Amino acid sequence: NCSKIHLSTKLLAVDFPAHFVKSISCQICEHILADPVETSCKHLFCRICILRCLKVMGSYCPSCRYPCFPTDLESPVKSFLNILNSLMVKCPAQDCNEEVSLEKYNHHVSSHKESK
Amino acid sequence: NCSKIHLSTKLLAVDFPAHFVKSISCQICEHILADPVETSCKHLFCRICILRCLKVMGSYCPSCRYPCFPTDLESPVKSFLNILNSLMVKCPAQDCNEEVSLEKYNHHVSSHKESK
């Protein structure tokens, strides 16, 4: 599943209120939004999660069921992207006790020193 | 009502996704949270809105209906307060076309020059 490529909200460093946690999560897969797109109805989903639902399930929003098309998919406003891209997350790599921002995460994972 | 003392979310400068807007709103009055407190169940309400509901309605969370007491009411985590206190809002005073942060709002309103 997308769990192999997406981050779980339980990796969030900060203990945020539940509705806020929900606001930065994909409304289909429930992971922290990865490449978020916004429907005409202002709901959020990872670009891949929504496109698949529109195909296999129909042209309706998974959240509210209002007509939804791939061509309607935009990027969330900048200020929202800023809040999301800044979330601090606890890296789960064994013995690593480091917390990094969502935008700096992939770099942190890669930069991890391998065994060899 | 609290509408005389609370700000409507339609005064928000930025057009945020609906679930995020919901996250920074009082789950009882629906205004932008004013002096937010968090229930044990991680839900948010203006300090005055929740205490009245606990009195007149019962000791249960308006959002989820899980037992709720005044003594359980804490302040939201700091990082959440930072996001909330920074929201940009469009002052509705006639001819004023100024946008200011939530924490600087009361100062902006007061500093408004009167007629006289």
Ligand SMILES: [Zn+2]
């Ligand atoms: Zn996912």
Ligand SMILES: [Zn+2]
């Ligand atoms: Zn997703």
Ligand SMILES: [Zn+2]
């Ligand atoms: Zn929708």
Ligand SMILES: [Zn+2]
């Ligand atoms: Zn690490």
Ligand SMILES: [Zn+2]
């Ligand atoms: Zn209110």
Ligand SMILES: [Zn+2]
């Ligand atoms: Zn309220």
Ligand SMILES: [Zn+2]
């Ligand atoms: Zn609750």
Ligand SMILES: [Zn+2]
């Ligand atoms: Zn003004």
